[PDB]
Design an enzyme around this catalytic site. Structure first.
Site, short mmCIF file in Angstrom:
data_model
loop_
_atom_site.label_atom_id
_atom_site.label_comp_id
_atom_site.label_asym_id
_atom_site.label_seq_id
_atom_site.Cartn_x
_atom_site.Cartn_y
_atom_site.Cartn_z
N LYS B 163 -3.34 39.74 -36.79
CA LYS B 163 -4.30 38.74 -37.22
C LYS B 163 -4.33 38.71 -38.75
O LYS B 163 -4.51 39.73 -39.38
CB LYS B 163 -5.65 39.03 -36.65
CG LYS B 163 -6.58 37.81 -36.69
CD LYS B 163 -8.04 38.28 -36.56
CE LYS B 163 -8.31 39.06 -35.29
NZ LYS B 163 -9.74 38.99 -34.91
N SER B 231 -1.22 35.85 -35.16
CA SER B 231 -2.34 34.95 -35.01
C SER B 231 -3.14 34.98 -36.31
O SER B 231 -3.04 35.91 -37.12
CB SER B 231 -3.18 35.36 -33.77
OG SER B 231 -4.45 34.74 -33.75
N1 LIG Z 1 -2.70 31.38 -35.45
C1 LIG Z 1 -3.39 31.33 -34.32
O1 LIG Z 1 -4.35 32.06 -34.02
C2 LIG Z 1 -2.91 30.26 -33.36
N2 LIG Z 1 -3.95 30.06 -32.32
C3 LIG Z 1 -5.12 29.34 -32.84
C4 LIG Z 1 -6.34 29.57 -31.94
O2 LIG Z 1 -6.26 30.64 -31.31
O3 LIG Z 1 -7.35 28.76 -31.90
C5 LIG Z 1 -3.28 29.37 -31.19
C6 LIG Z 1 -2.56 30.37 -30.31
O4 LIG Z 1 -2.68 31.54 -30.64
O5 LIG Z 1 -1.89 30.03 -29.30
#
Ligand SMILES: NC(=O)CN(CC(=O)O)CC(=O)O
Ligand SMILES: NC(=O)CN(CC(=O)O)CC(=O)O
Ligand SMILES: NC(=O)CN(CC(=O)O)CC(=O)O
Ligand SMILES: NC(=O)CN(CC(=O)O)CC(=O)O
Ligand SMILES: [Mg+2]
Ligand SMILES: [Mg+2]
Ligand SMILES: [Mg+2]
Ligand SMILES: [Mg+2]
Lengths: 370, 370, 370, 370
Positions: B163, B231
């Protein structure tokens, strides 16, 4: 009226207005323009009401058929061409072309081979849509088409592709001017109602169900056809029926089979359609087993009203951002293309009374020739 | 610092604010709240920027961990919990919980068994995002986490879930106040950039690539990690790293393995991850072979920039109606759930430098115990 | 039961979970937490079914009311709080707070000043929704609320904000278990049906229409209330009614008035509401005339079924990409904020039987004090 | 080269492929097909990349121009026709037609009357897009067009409507084959970049700004044109420039004027354009003052990067469900149509360097004749 042998070719669309692969098949002598009897394709629009990719493709294809044949644009206008918009995910725009084969190019056989019949129903009035009058008018046109294909046993019908009216502002109001009611006042809903009622008419024609009642439509999902693939669009005031099955004594190199997908992940249902069509495959097949013998699959999908798949909740039905029609189409496009190894697959949504709830019928056309 | 044996449980979310299955696992003695070291889940929001389902789940889960343990809400706030929103199609909301196992419940073995390491990087400034400073800071935190898991050979790292920050109005402007530039001025784009740069930092840490340059980021898609799952979300000014792999001499009943999906339809890539994790399967596996031994799979997907899958065009990248992120997620959700037979699968989008272009890494966690 | 003087404050939400401006009003002595009797706000979610911004705001606001007052969380749970999601375009998230004023802070006057009454209807069963049983149960609760506000003449009712059940999977099935039918089987549609039936119940209670029949609901759009603003959400099995009007002999510094917007562009209808509320304005007003005296406006909007505005076609009803609910909300948000000069406006959609077709009621609350 | 008097007519589109009102104007002798020099319209597609309504309209209109004139389809192909898709909310599909007037139908006057000039720039290579090479090539074509309209003072230029290339898969790769870079690799983003760079070229040509640098593009929003309205689409490898202003000594009955909308709610900016065009109006105008003398308005809109309007936050930029392009278009469509009283308004999005940030230029064409 007598059935003819069929040539069937699946071609990509390279852009929204492209019919060049049809033109090429004609130029190369694979088929004759005037012998094209049906086209069934996927186009890259949104798959909804305001999908103008269907008319673009339609114009492009009919232009070829008029230019390269002796049929007039009026005669060419009578050819059933069904465009199912929305190619979410990997689904590739394409058209499957069905044409009759001249007698001097066929070897007659007693084996079951592909046959096509076509019919138009009686006029379908706005107050018919979604009600038993639609069901009966459909049923009669499906019997007409079945006869036109040379098929007497419904067991030899594997795929019935249709096109039926929607309810519009104009037609809702016509009904009302005559003191008639309509099932719903929203265009979007009426596409699903129109397909569902048509499906029921197919199911009645083929002996899959007893004649249902008005209250069954959209509600009794245990009533369904295992071969119906229904679509809708403003262009008509009748149902256009394309029956695809097999007949013996016709000849040709293609054969059709079918099964059902019990749910969105039912790859084995797809493989069952391919086997039914006559391809011999391993016990656990893989796409690499197909070696160019699968022309296409045609199937329906849907989110079940219970909100679950294999006992797990999903949020498709509550999603106001991306309609579940588009979600499920993309999902099933993947599940399907993973079986076929080819993203040019006919995957359609709006499946009420088409296959079991949360699933859909699946038909496969295979090439059994040299 | 020494690795502990791990218990890993996948639980459904029955609604957006539901952590009751976590609470149940704790009540029933399956795991101890204070021993939960990571949670990685799927939530039912839109998967985009304005996805508030992630914070709802986050609150619900941290509330349980604080209520049922002795950790303070501050300590509980340090537990890495990653919510990947967007469950398009059949994907079922769920959380995978990782917890350490008390010594009196483990049988030590020389076999490879699941281990988890966690690290936070140095602070990641807005002008770092998507650039080599992010890559180096990530790389160092990934080495930290790898050490924390007891892993010396990168070959034993199978899944690195991260993250990282986004660029916001606030941070873009902070950069500018210090006379710094940012890679892009749009929040949406910055999520993909943030994941891509992080992925590169993972790839560098594990020896998968040489240190790249700024111009490579988002552009040289031949550079990628085969284990990165990245993410992003406003909550941080550092990268949170969760390394998941195996170590010998730890004990436990779970093991992780991985492969890559070469494209969106690559079911065999998924099966390869499951085999790598240590499940013995037939040559052509089917979901029915799994008999409850597959805990979960974790994978990334994407639409390739070339607009094609298995040589067929699709229209995903031009679709202004439904973003290709959502299309491809739904598609791959189906392809994946068809392998696992369980729609609770961790399928995520935003995959730059995570697996080959048009594909993604896939990791599988299996239960090898009684 | 006796009416009290009202203080009404409009506050922004700075984020999805922000109630800090409410907290500030309480800290600064503007109002007392335990005297908050209703809250009506706009939240930044999608305005659809899966809008989780409403529950986030709800929790944040109730937490303040429980923390800063002596009411228990149970008592605080009974306070009507209505969140209308979807702030498309410029619309700014906000909450309008209504509180009673202690006797030692009021100067009684014979002038009409703002009063609020609240009632809950009898239980509303799934088979009631959209049918005359809903209409009668609503009507009785609206008379209850009108009495609770001290209002005997319906002409002094200017705004009736409600919240009513939706039909869910769970309730549709409960109905069926008792051998009852429901008007529709889709959640999305049922929100519009629920609001429309409630509106009719308001119209009956106030003498605006005669008791209609089942077939009128959603169909006879010439039947409508000029003061109804109806919303729906899973949280209830009863209708929550907030009547806002004026009464004489109460005191206070605020007054409410209303008119209707005849169509989406009817700025003069908005100005008419503001004048009716008691602000003296020029013949052709402009936003700059308001000088902080307009607290808020509350209004409904919709796309007409005829597909036209001022004789020009639009494509809202056919748009499968962005639902017309969101289109019209954004449009009317602009038209409205252009009158008020303040993008914090309560603009809501789903307007069947709320104002004339293609329009909606509009209420204005003005500050007539020093 | 010498300017001619202009006839300008705004006509509705009754459906996506309708050019019947153009055909009617020609049949009735209002204008001559071969004298149509530009068309600028709104179409009902999504306003995004995959908007096929633009090509449908284009074909329909060019077919009329070829059928009813002596120009060949090749000559007709050179007529600038700009279709701005997306008619969110009330905006009505329409086309504004500009035609030259035969000498025997004009009364020459020294008053300023409408004139049109047209030019094509040098070829715009993919690596030019969004960079100073685009800016210089645009600037030179804008000077060419200004001369073609008979205008020497930039103060007499009121509206410059353009069309410029996008970056596609094909062109991004061409650049790369020559060892060139492109500003961005995403099609969607490149539309906004293309319009923004073009706008800057307009601003340079007219003396509104000094020549900027590459780093200014999309970033320095304080640099802008007060007359630029830029659009983009795959059909070209050059910029098409339509300059609309006034010249003295030409004659005709129409005149153009302009102002800017400072923000999305700036109705007074619209009224200022109408006054500038030469209509005498009251101090506080209302739509009812116009009495058929307003032909059309043409304007740009946008969500500001600061996320605020009149000091209130909105959530447009974070909205992954409905792109802010569509939100703001619908909003400004309402604000605009409320001024004009006619939902057939040319409201376009993608406004970088077109008007101040969060706003846009607005031009008005009025009929000053009998
Ligand atoms: N960069 C992210 O968190 C991308 N995410 C965004 C979210 O979770 O709203 C989409 C996913 O993980 O499939
Ligand atoms: N009824 C229909 O034609 C449904 N269609 C609508 C469309 O093609 O635009 C969707 C599909 O076929 O998958
Ligand atoms: N029935 C409703 O609550 C309609 N709401 C739904 C929602 O708030 O999410 C939209 C609106 O109020 O504008
Ligand atoms: N660059 C463009 O043409 C922007 N367009 C795109 C389109 O017309 O589809 C939107 C608009 O003009 O409002
Ligand atoms: Mg079905
Ligand atoms: Mg990848
Ligand atoms: Mg109304
Ligand atoms: Mg601007």
């Amino acid at each position: 009226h007598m059935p003819e042998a069929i040539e069937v070719r699946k071609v990509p669309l390279h852009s929204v207005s492209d019919a060049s692969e049809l033109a090429k098949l004609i130029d190369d002598g694979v088929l004759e323009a005037d012998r094209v009897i049906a086209v069934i394709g996927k186009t890259e629009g949104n798959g909804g009401v305001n999908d103008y990719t269907r008319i673009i493709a339609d114009r492009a294809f009919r232009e070829v058929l008029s230019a390269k044949g002796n049929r007039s644009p009026e005669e060419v206008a009578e050819v059933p061409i069904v465009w199912s918009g929305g190619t979410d995910g990997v689904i590739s725009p394409h058209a499957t072309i069905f044409a009759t084969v001249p007698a001097d190019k066929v070897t007659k056989t007693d084996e079951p081979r592909l046959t096509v019949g076509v019919a138009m129903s009686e006029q379908l009035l706005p107050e018919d849509i979604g009600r038993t009058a639609m069901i009966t008018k459909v049923a009669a046109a499906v019997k007409d088409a079945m006869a036109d294909a040379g098929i007497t046993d419904p067991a030899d019908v594997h795929y019935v592709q249709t096109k039926t009216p929607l309810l519009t502002i104009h037609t809702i109001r016509d009904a009302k001017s005559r003191g008639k009611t309509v099932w719903t006042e929203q265009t979007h809903e009426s596409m699903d109602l129109s397909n569902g009622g048509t499906a029921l008419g197919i199911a009645v024609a083929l002996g899959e169900i007893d004649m249902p009642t008005d209250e069954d439509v959209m509600h009794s999902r245990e009533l369904f056809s295992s071969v119906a693939s229904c679509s809708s669009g403003v262009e008509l005031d009748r149902a256009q029926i394309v029956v695809v099955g097999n007949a013996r004594g016709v000849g040709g190199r293609y054969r059709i089979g079918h099964s059902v997908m019990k749910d969105p992940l039912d790859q084995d249902g797809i493989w069952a359609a391919i086997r039914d069509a006559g391809l011999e495959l391993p016990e656990r097949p893989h796409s690499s087993d197909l070696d160019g013998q699968l022309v296409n699959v045609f199937l329906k999908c849907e989110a079940s009203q219970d909100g679950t798949v294999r006992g797990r909740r999903n949020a498709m039905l509550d999603d106001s951002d991306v309609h579940w029609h588009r979600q499920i189409k993309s999902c099933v496009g993947g599940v399907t293309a993973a079986v076929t190894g080819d993203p040019a697959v006919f995957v359609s949504v709006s499946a009420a009374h088409q296959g079991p709830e949360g699933g859909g019928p699946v038909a496969a056309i295979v090439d059994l020739g040299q």
